[model samples]
Target: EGVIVNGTQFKDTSGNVIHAHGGGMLKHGDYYYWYGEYRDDSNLFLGVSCYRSKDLVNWEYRGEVLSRNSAPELNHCNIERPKVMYNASTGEFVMWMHWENGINYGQARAAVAYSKTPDGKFTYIRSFRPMQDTGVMDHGLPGYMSRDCNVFVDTDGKGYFISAANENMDLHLYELTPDYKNIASLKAKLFVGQQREAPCLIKRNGYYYLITSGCTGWNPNQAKYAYSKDLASGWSQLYNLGNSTTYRSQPTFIIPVQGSSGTSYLYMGDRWAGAWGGKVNDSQYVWLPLNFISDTTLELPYYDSVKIDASSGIISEYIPDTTRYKLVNKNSGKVLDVLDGSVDNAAQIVQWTDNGSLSQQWYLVDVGGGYKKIVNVKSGRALDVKDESKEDGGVLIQYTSNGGYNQHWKFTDIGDGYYKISSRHCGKLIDVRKWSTEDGGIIQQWSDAGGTNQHWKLVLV
Candidate 1:
């Protein structure tokens, strides 16, 4: 199982960059297939591309399912968000997407195409305005806008189509006919006038969840999610799902991996670089574990990469933090230690003889803004300034980590494996008190004197 790197361009097995943005995932038998829009500079219809993956890491391209000339309307159309679902009753894979005329997006029609097999030479059907006379949208819009859409096949084999409707101010849910090639009923209008797009719907634990983004095109925005036990009538209010700008991604799909242990949900997002003035077609992607903090709350925390156990459906984060060291005084050659191996708070810190004890070792816990928490291994506390001191010759102690400025220190490389550690609270460096060369010299804080007494060597142990 290879790791999935977040927010990076993914090349397929053919060594070509994957062009499957605005894609949808479907697990067919033992393999999973993804369908997406093949975009170009024109942002018109290039194709609805396909790819298959067994481990969700290494994807093999399956070629285009529907391309230009597949249909007259699609020849010069802006075909966005191609979502395909298998119609078991008809033994056909039906594809659904949002269609707009190449000149403008006023059409906002829902298009259809189907194939006998997954790697499709899918025959194009037609694009139509599904819900026109539905009084749900009282704005007197010409037709219901069906842009940025997806298709979800329920457990009972009922198909539902969700898309940004009413000029993307609302999301309209339409139940697909048994054939799954046409809309059978208008289920409900959700997030009315909320201007939600990039809608990704999922079901788990008797709840149907809808993940969505704002109306900003190609610009990342805050993602929100709404859930309900019922799909049509009883929907919940939208809640923030990820960080502002959704960690620089707009959600496309939610891949549910059903393993022997349990089911794991993976949030798939395209890190659109348009706002950064970069290529949107060549944008990177982010696949993160969508964790359920509670029955209703969810979080999309970022990791550089994620290790996925496909069989166990266990997703674990891999954050690199292997740097741990003992700080040895440059002049005295003694290691910084927590006094008397004390685990209690506010224990006086001193320079002691290097003995390879955990009391002498420290782990630099990153607290951001060019600062870190100099945590002692023995006490599990931080090297702190006494009373949040702001003057020279302040006493240094091992205190409980409260993430204050006094507990944060920044290291400047002074050269030769040695660094000058400065406290954020006082702008003082950890200095051996009175220039003492003794083994039990008290380590106090002093303004940067640019001396060896304030310099410490990081001996990784």
Candidate 2:
């Protein structure tokens, strides 16, 4: 809301400069840790810095989270754009950065740092180019010119390292191991020749969005986005989000926030210094409300920042519509009537109900990709496919808990308020009109190719 200088009065724990150049925020437990490049009066890259904040504002400076180690060469290290992530399995927090041999831009390495506690000082870990062990291609594809970088964790908790694309004009994505010490030898090449960097990613409504900047160095460039139904597959064409950057700001990160209405998110960017007589000063925050205009396009215009009220959880004015509900499930390829629609208990769901019982009644909570959380009205428990049983003509039965893939169901809408739900384990839909028939038989996930038995309808109660 209010304006502040680049590194003005924001002092850290030692009453020194705030370690917040090219930084990002990570909420670990009760506190949020801010990591960035700590520099001196000359603006040369110093080392990685960390600070703690009760609220997003008013950060109490914590000491150096990472610094040049005892290694002689590290003494001349140039560290910038530090980002941190926590690994629950290993019980450690990892820090990654764009490091150089010295004040010069050459000898770029993706260095790492680790710590056991949220507020503890981080220990310097080894740094190396991903897939370098195999001595494969040149490291400059994503960029030897590393600058703004970010770490992304998928729905499955897999980690990925994203950096400013290098001379190759492609964004590089590397899979991080459980410990976050190294990236896999294999990497995926995405977005070739788009000339974009500063990647910020988010997932919503069956789509994954990656936002990046054009290769204009530290200067501002328009932000562009790419979409995909599969995180690693079928990436869509890029779209230009026409805002903020044109206002001289660059995308830094997207913070997902839960709101009273629905899921609301914030787009964060930094309006780097404006040159004044060769000396730069005015550094502002370009905060925007991110809105999905369509499956492929999004609208995120810069909104004026406001003092965040800590108690009320008053977010950046972006609001979400909670009235609509999303129901997802595996598609049943057939459409048939429920046999007796028995309602006494979650009776056997059969095909061709003649008229039918309510036992065949099912509700779905969509989790994207035609997949849904299915519930049988009689049991109140989910209609989990017993196991991934793939037998044909198997009777659909109800299960208690959400287990492995066997429990996940997919639903396909057949129009006329009718739909079908399938299972992930078996390749067959939970057919009532005759797809499944065996008692205690497993629920299977099948393709919905439009059959009568596979068709279903849901009434919101």
Candidate 3:
């Protein structure tokens, strides 16, 4: 409806900076509800800030929907990432968020509140870690931790909740009960030990894509994504989705602007300036157009301003893949080949001379959401991380198909036909040991450092 100036303070009609940090949007009836952590005052949290908009540009401050002074627990608690979902059957607007007891971030509980209308006052129901009272520990932690969470409702009226759990080491996707008040079951544990936070999930084209950032408190980092055919399982590898450091911001939500033409997804992020020498209350936003580069991949480039039809949900651009290639290391000039040319399940992938053999040829098959399954032309197996390890230096091996997240990979274009490869399980890059260029140098998965050792050139074979 208006020009979105990148990296500038967005104001409401009153000419005041919108202080809804870690915010989310919910379109109910003719109006959209925008709620987030209210940090405008000197207090740690001033309750959830609420706003409304019909055109998605001009937002009208609707005052605090969840008042801190009304409740004892919420008076001094850290309530962030407030996401509201409308349940047609129940005729209730349910809000779920990451609620902590204080700024120490120890409580790590999920709080639920509800109201009858979008901008109405929400009555706090209760707060608890999912399944903690039932003694349910799926992925082996103390209990279900619910920090940096999001809520999703399926077309079949089923609801799901995703959060950074297990000490922020894994992202657990839990199925919500029929009433959307509590958790029903622990669905899936993804990206174990990856330390990802600020999770936002959206369903598009029969796939559930999740966008998240590295767990660097208040600091900007790269944005990564993973997709799954089902919400509970079969999550593909994580891929880098945005520019370096995610355009100097952290992800909050994905707003799907619906229109007669189609739906255009909007990537919403907060450039937390206060964390790095700017005012927190006056912090700016970084809104970019989330473009679907392929049927399963997404590319979000920095835009100074974007145009939307306001009636037709059509975007400005839609980018369009590769097949067999001998992946050569940018630092070593050695090719990726299966050890001894054995067509076995647990064959080791090593850097060796390129002989134009089947062991070195790989097919970068699109799995969805900008990720690929790197399959060897000979072994019929996919390139996998050893034991699906989520450590810093995991052994990279080829294994039989099991549809695990470790088997999925993504290629971040680095110009000159060179790409940086990252895995779906650990969110680490496929790296060469010690930056060695020698023949038979071991291949492993390490954290992305933008090194040449992590860069590879895919030569068409």
Best by lDDT: 1
- lDDT of the candidates, in the order given: 0.83, 0.57, 0.80
Q: Cα RMSD to native, each candidate?
A: 7.9, 16.2, 12.6
Q: Write the per-residue lDDT of candidate 2 for residues 1-461, one digit (tens) a residue.
A: 32222213355546654546667767676676777665545554555667886555566766666655524455666776677887878889888887775656655468777889866778776666555556454544332344456787677777778765455376777778877777863356678777677788678877878987777765777788889887667887778774434446677777664434465565666666642222222344555556664677676633222234333433443112112222222233222222244332224533332223344445454444656555554433445444345666555555433233555676556687765656766657655433444332223334555665455555443
Candidates sorted by lDDT, descending order?
1, 3, 2
Is 2 or 3 the stronger prediction by TM-score?
3
Residue 321 in candidate 2 has what lDDT?
Answer: 18
Reference-based lDDT, residue 133, model 2 = 51
Return the top candidate by TM-score.
1
TM-score for all predictions?
0.73, 0.60, 0.67
lDDT accuracy of residue 83 in candidate 2: 79
User: Using alpha carbons, what is the TM-score of model 3?
Assistant: 0.67
lDDT by residue (tens digit), candidate 3, 1-461 = 45566677778888877888888988877777788876535546677888898767788988887867647888778888888888878899888988886667878888999988888889998778888877766455346888999888887888888898888898888888888877899888888998889999898888889998998877777789988888777888889876557877899999788889888888888988766676566678877777765657776755445455546765441111336789999989989988888875567778888778888898776667878788788755679999889887788898754446788898889899999889988789999889988878888999999889999998986
**Backbone Cα, N, C clashes tallied per candidate:** 0, 46, 4
Residue 271 lDDT (model 3) = 86
Q: Please identify model 1 stretches exceeding 4 Å from their true place.
A: 132-142, 321-461
lDDT of 1 by residue, 131-168 (tens): 66564442444557788898898989999999887778
